[PDB]
Amino acid sequence: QPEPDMITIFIGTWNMGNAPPPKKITSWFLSKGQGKTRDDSADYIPHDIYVIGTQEDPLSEKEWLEILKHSLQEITSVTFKTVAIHTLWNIRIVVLAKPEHENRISHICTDNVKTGIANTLGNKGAVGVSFMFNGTSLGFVNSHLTSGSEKKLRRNQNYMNILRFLALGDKKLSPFNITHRFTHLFWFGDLNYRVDLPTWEAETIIQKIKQQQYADLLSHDQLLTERREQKVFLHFEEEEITFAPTYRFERLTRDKYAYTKQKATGMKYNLPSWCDRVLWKSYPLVHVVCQSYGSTSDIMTSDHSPVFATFEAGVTSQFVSKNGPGTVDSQGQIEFLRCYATLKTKSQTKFYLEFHSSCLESFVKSQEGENEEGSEGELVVKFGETLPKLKPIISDPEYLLDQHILISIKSSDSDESYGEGCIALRLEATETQLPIYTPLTHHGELTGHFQGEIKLQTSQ
């Protein structure tokens, strides 16, 4: 039975509004309703992995697991296995997989982050799950961010706290946050970003939604505008939105948006908004294709509609050679030429690099770079031809060209990372000098760039 080179992943996010679900929720898992929907011809084809994020979830873990498993069983006639379940307050993540993936899934981690302080600590935050699927690392984050149209900067801060403090994936990747630890990272939830238009325009917005004319609404979506201004979710992707706003509905119908200020809302307006979102970040040149992104029309117990997204994702096999794992493959090497880091820092410490990759036995520390003053004020750290030669555990090009090198640039004085990035080994040529580039981030914000050339030698 061959190992797969692709899997499909279902991502669901649903703010349940503290109400039990209706008896039938299959439309969610089938990607049916509004937006980019799944073809009917696929209905009986199970996804490989289902990741369900809820917010304001009133059910016990046992109650929700039984509903989810019975739902998937009805759709597919497959009894899915529970990979992980983790709950913080009323924010929950469930990961289910085809039982045929029992010996492909390992290194399962869960964690949560509570956002806010004092007044604002006690119901918002995030849960997450990671695991390995054969040679591929997968991370999943369900976050419930701060509510309210005038709190976009709070949401952005909640995002930064979650990606700093959520402890998933390989702890040996010590300089790296969750935005670098996974081949594929999916981040979803009630992100709570709103359509920033004046309150007086509520009925105009409703009209536009009835016409399915979303362009003038999406141009004011706070998540899209904050992303475009690099304030949040830097280097994440989102499919185009082609479904109506998923909040705030009168319960038991989808015919009415309930937007007016009420004592129950803290006298706040809830203009129709795309609160409920799925974004992703995959390592460079790894296959990932969104195959659905939409909302259900027939699940009406909450003031939010469920959101679905599905993906094709590239995966690699757990490679064994005659040599690695447990030795090097002399026949392989990774060389770096004309390399320099450009950093936004005002500091003047010496810097060194660390190279981390599951194609290395352990991470590799470089010598210190040579600091120069860049012409527009920046710091340029030159490595030139000084970087170590990396010795992969396996030299087979079918393995090595699928790998990635994580890079951290660290202060010699504090051993703190000033920037993290990722280089793909999926090169156009081997034994050939080729340009490489990554942006560098720290705490998920841009701090610089790393560029140079690479020379990859495989067994072929």
Ligand X SMILES: C[C@H](c1ccccc1F)N1CCNCC1
Ligand Y SMILES: C[C@@H](c1ccccc1F)N1CCNCC1
Residues that bind ligand X (CB under 6 A): 81, 83, 97, 99, 101-103, 105-106
Pick one of ligand X, ligand Y, none as the site partner of residue 224 (Cβ within 5 to 8 A by kind).
ligand Y
What are the percentages of helix, strand and coil residues in the chain, rounded to 5?
15, 35, 45
The DSSP element (H or E) to which 380 belongs, if any, is strand 379-384
Residue number, 124 or 184, with CB nearest to ligand X:
184
Q: Contact between 277 and ligand Y (CB under 6 A)?
A: no
Q: Contact between 446 and ligand Y (CB under 6 A)?
A: no
Cα–Cα distance, 118 to 128 (Å, whole number)? 23
* Torsion of the alpha carbons at 232, 235, 237 and 238, rounded to the nearest 10: 10
Residue number, 225 or 331, with CB nearest to ligand Y:
225
Cα–Cα distance, 13 to 294 (Å, whole number)? 11
Pick one of ligand X, ligand Y, none as the site partner of residue 94 (Cβ within 5 to 8 A by kind).
none
Query: From edge to edge, which strands make up the β-sheet containing 370-373?
Result: 364-365, 351-356, 404-411, 417-424, 434-442, 445-457, 333-343, 379-384, 370-373
Residue number, 223 or 393, with CB nearest to ligand Y:
223
Pick one of ligand Y, ligand X, none as the site partner of residue 228 (Cβ within 5 to 8 A by kind).
ligand Y
**Least separation, in Å, of the C-beta of 311 and ligand Y?**
16
Q: Contact between 152 and ligand Y (CB under 6 A)?
A: no
C-alpha distances in Å from residue 9, one per residue of 157, 186, 193: 28, 10, 25
**Least separation, in Å, of the C-beta of 317 and ligand X?**
17
Pick one of ligand Y, ligand X, none as the site partner of residue 237 (Cβ within 5 to 8 A by kind).
ligand Y
**Least separation, in Å, of the C-beta of 103 and ligand X?**
6
**Least separation, in Å, of the C-beta of 318 and ligand X?**
13
Closest CA to 458 of 425, 430, 426, 420: 430
- Give the phi and the psi of residue 74 in degrees, each rounded to 5: -65, -45
**Least separation, in Å, of the C-beta of 68 and ligand X?**
14
Q: Contact between 290 and ligand Y (CB under 6 A)?
A: no
**Least separation, in Å, of the C-beta of 132 and ligand X?**
10
Instruction: Identify residue 82 by its one-letter amino acid code.
Output: T
Strand-pair category, 307-314 with 288-295 = antiparallel
211-240 binders of ligand Y (CB under 6 A):
224, 227-228, 237
Instruction: Give me the residues that bind ligand Y (CB under 6 A), please.
Output: 224, 227-228, 237
